[PDB]
C-alpha cells in the first residue's frame with residue numbers, strides 16, 4: 001500500500017489524516033512512525049511524506065493532499081478548476097501560514113535556550129497569527145462552513161494546533177464565529193481521531 | 199489589472215517573475231514594491247495578505263491570492279502555451295515534489311538569513327544553524343543524485359523552483375559552498391542561468 005511517513009503531533013500531517021478519513025481512504029495507507037528533527041537532522045526526512053509503490057516519495061503536505069484528492073470518487077475537496085480553486089487554496093495557504101508561524105513560536109519557546117529568545121521576532125510571528133484569525137472571522141466564516149474541504153480542513157488543523165501548543169493565546173474571545181464553527185467541526189469523526197497527543 | 203507585491207530579493211517572488219517571463223505574461227502584471235521582514239512589516243501588504251509575506255497577487259476584482267504556489271498555479275492557466283505545471287498524471291506529482299524540495303531549501307535559507315542578518319549575534323543558535331545547513335545540503339545531494347536529467351528535460355515548475363533556490367543561496371549565503379559537491383547541478387544551473395527569464399530576474 002501507500003506508506004505515509006507520519007507523526008501524530010504535526011498539524012501538517014493532520015491535514016493529510018483528516019482528508020484520508022473524510023474521503024474514506026484511511027485503509028489504503030500504512031502509517032510509518034517517523035522521527036522529528038527540529039533542531040538538526042525518505043532520505044530528507046520529510047513529514048508528512050507519501051511513498052508510492054515504485055519507491056517514489058511525494059511531499060510536502062500540499063502535494064500529498066492534491067494527490068490523495070484524486071484517488072477517491074467522492075466530491076473533490078480541492079476544486080479542480082475555476083475561481084473556487086484559487087479561493088479555497090488561498091484559504092488553505094492562510095491556514096498553512098498560521099501553522100508556520102505557530103510552529104516557529106513553538107520551536108523557539110520549546111527548543112531554543114531562553115537567553116537566545118528574541119521578543120520582537122516572537123511578537124512578529126504572533127502578529128501573523130492574530131491578523132490571519134481576524135481575516136477568517138471577518139471574511140471567511142460562511143466559506144469555511146460551506147464545504148469541509150481543503151480550506152476548512154487546513155484551518156481546522158491550524159486551530160487545533162493553536163489549542164495544543166499555544167493555549168495562552170486565547171483566540172475564541174475575539175473570533176466567536178470561528179469558535180462556534182470549530183466547536184462543531186471538532187466533533188467530526190475525522191477530527192476526533194486525529195487530535196495531537198497529550 | 200493584476201498587481202503583484204514584489205521585491206527583487208525574494209526567491210518566491212522570483213519564481214512568479216520567471217514564470218511570467220517564460221509564458222509571455224509580464225505586461226499583464228503591475229508590480230507593487232514591498233520591503234518587509236517579520237520585525238518590519240509592510241502595512242499595505244498586510245491588508246491583502248494577513249501573513250505579511252510576498253508574493254501576493256491582487257486580481258482585477260480585488261481578491262488576493264497567496265502563497266507563491268497558489269499564484270503560480272493560477273498564472274499557469276492564464277496563458278495558452280505548454281503548461282509549466284502538469285495538470286494531470288504522475289508527472290504532476292513528481293514535478294510538484296521536486297518544486298517542494300526546492301521550496302524547502304528556500305524556506306530554510308530564508309530562516310537562516312533572518313537569524314544571521316536580523317537576530318542579535320549573541321542570540322544566534324549555532325546548533326539549529328548547523329541543522330539547517332545540513333538540511334539544505336541533503337536536499338542538494340538528492341537533486342544531484344536523482345533529478346538532474348529530470349530538471350534539464352523541461353524548464354517548468356520544478357526547474358524554475360530549483361533555479362530560484364540556487365540563485366538565493368548565491369545571493370544571501372555566498373559563503374555556503376554548494377557547487378563543489380554537486381557538479382551536475384552546478385553545470386545545469388550555469389546553463390539555465392543564461393535563459394532570458396533568469397537574467398531578467400536576478401537579485402540586486
Ligand SMILES: N[C@@H](CCC(=O)N[C@@H](CSCCC(=O)O)C(=O)NCC(=O)O)C(=O)O
Pocket residue numbers: 207208209210234235236237249250251252253265266267308311370
Ligand atoms: N510560503 C511563502 C513564503 C514567502 C516568503 O517567505 N517571503 C519572504 C521574502 S523572501 C526574501 C527574504 C530576503 O530578503 O532575503 C517574506 O515575505 N518574508 C516576510 C516575513 O516573513 O515577515 C511563499 O511560498 O510565497
